[PDB]
């Protein structure tokens, strides 16, 4: 019942971002695109980094390496909370889709 946005185009971009998060571990091509957005915009997940805890095939206590403040190979495996971006991506990436 609750919704993060009211505009139709903004809420559908939000679901599109969350949909490709589900396809992150099922496709390497999909995962590479999201790694750029999370790296360039310095963010993790849709609204928070804790969104990854709900993604199947995403290991426990693991976030994508692009979520780390400094992107190194394997930095997301057994990550530390103080070494990743906690803020989500949806608002800062597509906020201009609001009315």
């Amino acid at each position: 019942s609750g919704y993060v946005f009211r505009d139709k185009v903004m809420s559908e971009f939000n679901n599109n971002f969350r949909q490709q998060m589900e396809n992150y571990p099922k496709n390497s091509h999909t995962a590479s695109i999201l790694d750029r957005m999370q790296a360039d915009f310095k963010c993790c997940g849709a609204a928070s980094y804790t969104d990854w805890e709900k993604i199947p095939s995403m290991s426990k206590n693991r976030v994508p390496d692009s979520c780390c403040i400094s992107v190194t190979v394997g930095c997301g495996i057994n990550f530390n909370e103080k070494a990743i971006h906690k803020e989500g991506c949806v608002e800062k990436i597509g906020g201009w889709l609001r009315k």
Partner: nanobody
Amino acid sequence: QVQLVESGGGLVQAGGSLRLSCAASGFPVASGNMAWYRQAPGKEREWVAAIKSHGYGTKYADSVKGRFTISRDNAKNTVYLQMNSLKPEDTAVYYCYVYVGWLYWGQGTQVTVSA
């Protein structure tokens, strides 16, 4: 925009269970410090359950530890309050709050436990 609409309140017997929901509109629950309050008529208002933003942890009042469990679903942007082993001392109107600089709350929902 800060909307908080409590629902799920009702009447249950002593020792039963009840689940409250707090449909928040206008902000993501995953990055918001949210807590469940309650106030019975005659008594003073009090906070019972809480979940901080991101993974900063949850917190519970001592009178409800182990019985109540606060949860956070992102697909519906809703904070839940699972209330197990309810006591007649838990009869109150339950409100959900949000702390984002200031405080915002909803209308609340009535919870009553018989016997």
